[model samples]
Target: HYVEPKFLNKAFEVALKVQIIAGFDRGLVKWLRVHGRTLSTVQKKALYFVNRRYMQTHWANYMLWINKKIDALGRTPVVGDYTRLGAEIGRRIDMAYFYDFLKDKNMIPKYLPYMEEINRMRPADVPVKYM
Candidate 1:
């Protein structure tokens, strides 16, 4: 569900939900952080997927971001914005998600089964190839 503040709030909600379902409290998710300074495209996509999965498993706390900021006025903490927080937490989840994707399950190769298929597709007749 989209958070009332919309956009980032909604994304944050997804991250929070995922943490809860993973046997963590919503507060616990707030402590998680992305080690890297920036996230790559693949990393971002993985985060989105994790957020979606989390939201699906737990729907509560979708509106928590809108609640009054408990910190000090005009001194709000850094890096806790709904959208940013979601991405940060998503980063942590990405590590595990990537491992799970790459882990050999049965005879299937890990690391995103659809990645090759996705790359195989022609892009506007200009096939995309990573440099």
Candidate 2:
């Protein structure tokens, strides 16, 4: 759960984007302000899980993949939804569910790394990949 600052920032950036894409909840923000650090750890673990599965080292790919997957849900995602989603992602499907969902919807590409690189740039400089 020792999340690097850079990784934490990207994870938070994605989390905030998801919030905006859904609907900003003051209550969720308040809860996050209190538990953001723990959530950062959780985010890191989730990213780690994905990275290992794809044999990729760049956090950006995982970040983008996660962003797209969440966006693909195409509905307002609550904090509780992410809590359950993250749990399910870690314990059960390992993104295969979403991967298949995207594929079935013709979202996959010929290349594996569908996202841009983040390691070379400052975390703040990285643009939002989806929406």
Candidate 3:
């Protein structure tokens, strides 16, 4: 709905600022050891669902959903803002599915849609091991 460049820019600025303040160094290769990967039972199940979706879908569709959700947020009047939408994310799929998918996949899976696409685009000799 409301797709103003300024609001989008500000959101990006805030994200970047937070990352900088968190002391994440450029080109950091942090290892998230999966052996002892701990999470609540609910979180683990949610992550599995997300991981499966990630391995199946196209990455570009995820980005498109994000842009649509942002546009919807921008359209909301002052009475309804980011806070309201933030709370309602879990209840709305089309509007916040991308965020949910990313968050859930972070703990349990490596997004391999791009890799799958690459394999499809090129000639590959191996079977698609989606496990």
Candidate 4:
């Protein structure tokens, strides 16, 4: 489903997320400022896990975007002109952030058997996705 217009939009968004996590130092002192006194113990843990999930998801997306962008930009993949575009798009990601979250989730723990369990703490007005 690598449609032209859709991939273009997400490429920019993932680029920004890569920068955001980078500036946050991948969840450091900034975590306290963003989430402290704002979420309860269980909810805080879920939010962290959700963000970690997005990190890897974006990396996978970049792999596909690179393929499609190269396809559309009129160049041989071997010449790596598209890779140059990749560099510009992904300057913030170290690439290992992809695998970090990969192995982190590789050993998947069993959940509480209910998404609604966490819904108890979920707020209708709050931004569900982490910044």
Index of the highest-TM-score prediction: 4
State the lDDT of candidate 1 residue by residue for 68-110, as single tens digits.
4423236653435544444444344434443234322322233
The residue-by-residue lDDT of candidate 4 on 34-103, one tens digit each, is 4356445554454444444444456556556556766786654443453355445444544345334433
Shift in Å, residue 32, candidate 3: 21
Evaluation by TM-score, superior candidate among 1 and 3: 1
- Each prediction's RMSD over C-alphas, in Å, is 13.2, 16.0, 14.0, 13.3
TM-scores for every predicted model: 0.27, 0.24, 0.22, 0.30
- Per-residue CA lDDT of candidate 2, range 3-84, in tens? 5555334445544333322221232334345545644443433332333323223335545655676787879655555544
CA displacement after TM-score superposition, residue 106 of candidate 2 (Å): 43
Which pairs of residues collide in model 2? none
- Compute the lDDT of residue 119 as modeled in candidate 4: 32
Tens-place lDDT per residue, model 3, 77-100, is 342343343233322333124434
What is residue 38's positional error in candidate 2, in angstroms?
A: 31
Candidate 2 weakest ten by summed lDDT? 19-28
Better of 2 and 3 by lDDT: 2
